[PDB]
Design a protein around this nucleic acid. Sequence first.
RNA 1: GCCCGGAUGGUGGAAUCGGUAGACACAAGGGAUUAAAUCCCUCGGCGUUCGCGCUGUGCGGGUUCAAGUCCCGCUCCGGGUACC
Length: 813
Amino acid sequence: MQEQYRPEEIESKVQLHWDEKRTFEVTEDESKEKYYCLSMLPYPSGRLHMGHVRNYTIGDVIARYQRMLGKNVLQPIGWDAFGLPAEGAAVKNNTAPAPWTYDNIAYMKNQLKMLGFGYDWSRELATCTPEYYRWEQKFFTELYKKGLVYKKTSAVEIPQWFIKITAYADELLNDLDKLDHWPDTVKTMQRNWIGRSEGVEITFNVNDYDNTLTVYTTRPDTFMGCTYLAVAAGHPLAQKAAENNPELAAFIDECRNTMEKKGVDTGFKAVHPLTGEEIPVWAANFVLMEYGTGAVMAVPGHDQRDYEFASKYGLNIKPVILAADGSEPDLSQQALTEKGVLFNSGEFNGLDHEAAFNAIADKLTAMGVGERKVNYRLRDWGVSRQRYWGAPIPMVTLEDGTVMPTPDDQLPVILPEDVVMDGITSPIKADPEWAKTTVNGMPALRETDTFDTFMESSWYYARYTCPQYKEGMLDSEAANYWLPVDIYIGGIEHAIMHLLYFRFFHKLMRDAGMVNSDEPAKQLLCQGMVLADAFYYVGENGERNWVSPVDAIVERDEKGRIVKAKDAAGHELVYTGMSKMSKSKNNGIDPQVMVERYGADTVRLFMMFASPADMTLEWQESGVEGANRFLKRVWKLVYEHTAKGDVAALNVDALTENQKALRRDVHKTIAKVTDDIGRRQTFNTAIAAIMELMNKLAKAPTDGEQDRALMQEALLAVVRMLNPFTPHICFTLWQELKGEGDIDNAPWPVADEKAMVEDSTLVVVQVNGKVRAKITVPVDATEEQVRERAGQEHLVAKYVIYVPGKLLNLVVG
RNA sequence: GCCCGGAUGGUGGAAUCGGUAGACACAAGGGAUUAAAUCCCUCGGCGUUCGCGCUGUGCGGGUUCAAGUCCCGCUCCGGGUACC
C-alpha cells in the first residue's frame, strides 16, 4: 500500500474495472427485490455543470447503498439530445446540430465516468436517435386515432398540434393524494397549475348580433348583480363591432402588442335572461380569450376586477350579496368578495351561497341558457415547433386536403442529420422535396414541424427498462418489473412542466396496456441549487462588471467576514453574497477543474456533506479542502493498520471495557448511518457520524492482538459506510484490508445488537427545568432507585417528572 | 398585491422523539515544526476568585412541569405568479 492517497493513480483504474466487469449492469431478476434510482437525464450542452454533479452524486449514493443492502439496482443514464441550443451552436460554428450533439455526448459521457457514477451503461439512450424517437412517433399516431390529438391555430398566431392533456386533468389532480413521497410544494404547484374550476356557462341574446354570446362564471350566485358583460380583445363579437368603431379597432390592435383595467364599449346590447333588461357588452383587457368562452359577465359589486373597470368607466355597481353579519355591504371603496346570503335578487333573496349557486344554475339550465361547466387552467399540450432539431411529427396532408397519420410501414420518419443551417429556415422546410411523399396511393406533404423536446423526456424513464426492445415502445414485463421508479431526483424548476407531462404520459401508457401502474415515480427528491460567492465592480461608465470569486482579493475582519475586496487590476469590488451560479454573475465553478484538482471522491464527499440534499449548497473551496484532508486521514489510518499485517480473529467475550465501549460506538455509528442514509435521507449527518467515529478510531491503541482485530472490524465497516460517497478510495482500501471480493458486491454493515447494550445510562437531574446534576444509573433501575440516587447527590440536596434513562425534573416547593 | 417557503454561534449546519442547544466541519486563536503544508489544543455572549455563575435559537405572545421543535401574532429574508 502506498503511503500517500493519490486519486489520479486510483480513480481511472477503478472506473475501467467497473466497465470491464460490467459491475452496474442489471437484468429483470425475479430472485431479488428491485430498486429503480433515477436522476433527471442531462441535456448535452457540452460540459457538466455543478448542478449535474450534485444531482447525480445524490443518485449514485442511493444506488450504491441499495446495492449493498442486497437489492437489484437500476441506475440509468442517457441524453435528452434534441432542442434549440444545437441549432444556435451549429450556426455559430461551422457545423450541423447532429455532430455537435454527439461530440458533446461523448465529452460529457467521459465526465460522468470520471466522477465514477455506477450506471448501467448498456441501457444508455440518446433521444435524438431514430431507435428512440420512432416509438414516440408511433405512439402519437395511436393517440390521434383514439381522438386525443387535434390541430388548431393558437398564439405562442401559429397552427399547432395539441395533445388533449385536459382529458386527464381530473385524474392528474386527484392522483396527487397518492403521492405521499412527493414534496408538498411540488404537489401544490401542480394543483394550482391544473386549476380545476366548477362553474356555469350562461348564454345571452345580442340584439343586432347574429350569434349568441356565452360567458363562464364561478359565481352564478351574483348573477342579479350583473350590470354588463365583458369580452376578450380577440373575441369575434368584438371584431364585428370593431368594423364600424375605430375606438374599438385600435383597442384590439393595441392588446396584441406591448394590472390596470382597460376597455372600450362595443355598442352591442345583451339581454339579461332573468330580468330581460339590456346590458352593454364591453371589450376588456383582463379577459383571456383562451380560457373558458373568452367572455365574462361583470358584477362590479362582487368581483374586484369588475369593480375597478366599472369605477373607471362609470358603469353600474349593484350590490347583491350581504356581509358576514347580515348587513348590506360597504361598496363605496371596493367589491364585497366573500360569499354570502343574497339580497336584491328577487326569487333568490335569502338563499345562502351554495343554495343561490344551485338555484340560479338550475333555473338557467331549465330555461336552456345555462349549463354547469368544469374548466381547467391547464391548457392542452402544444407539442409542435417550427424547429429543425427535433423528432418529426408523423402526420401528413394528402392533396385531398385530408389529413391523417404517417402509415406504420413508413415509421420512423427520420430527421436527416446531414444538413447546412442557413440560420433562418429549417432545412426540412427549405428543401421543398423533403416534405413530398406518397400516402395511401396518393401524393402528400408530410409535417415539417417537429415535436417539442418534452415529448422525449416524458417517457425515457420507462424506455430505460427495455432500451433495445425492437418489438414495441415498451416490453411490458420488463417495464412493470422496474416501475414505478423508487426515487426520482432533480430540480424543483421542472414541477409544472416535465413533472406533470411524465405523469400524463405514464397514464396514457397505462391506458394502452403498456404498463401496470398509475404513477411513474413513488418518491420525488428535489435537490437544492449550488451557490457561489458573487462580486462586481462599477466601471467609469456606470456599468456593473462581474468578477469571478477566484479573482477576488478579499480582506476579512477579525471574525473572518469579508469587509473589502479588490481584483488584481485594482477595481473596488462589492460582495453580493452567496448566489445561484450563472454566466451573467460570472461565478460558475467548473466541476472538471475540481475533479482534476482534488479527485472525484473529494468533490462527491463535499457535495454530500455540506448541506441537506433538499437545501441550497454553498460552494466553499475551504470546505472541499476539508473533505480532501478527511479522506487523507482515512487513507492514513488504513495504511498504518495494514502496515502491521494480518490480525487475529476477534474474541468478543475476552474484550476489555475500553475495547467493548469502542466497539459499541462502531456499531451505534453503523445503525445511525444506516438510518440516515436509508430512511431519513440525511446524508450530511451520516457523513458527520462517520467522521466522528474516525476521530475516535484515530486515538485507539493498535499494538495488542485484540486492539488490532477490533480496528479491522471498524475499518472494514467505515470503508463500507463511506463507499456510496467515495467509492474509488473505498474500492482500493477494501482490497488493502483484504475484504472479500469487490466492495461493490460487499454487504452493507449490520449493527451487531449484542454489541450495543449499554449497562448504564446518564440521567439529567433538573430543578424547575434547569439542569443541576448529571448521574449514572443502570438501564435496569426502577423509578425509586433513580430518585434515591438523585437524592444522594449533594447539589440536588441543596435544591416530580421522570423519563426513563433520560431526565428527572423537580418543580420546586 | 399575490401564493409557498424560511430566520439557531464568525460561517455551513446538528438537535429524528417537546426533554443536556450548537454534533460534524469550515474560519479564527494557541501548540509542535520551517513560510506553506500536515499533525496537538481552545472557540456562542457576558461576568469571573479561572473553579465556575448568569444568559442565549429574529421580536412579541399562547400551551406545558419543560418549547429551537407544537399553536397564534409581528418584523425581516428568499422563491414562485400574472387578471384563469
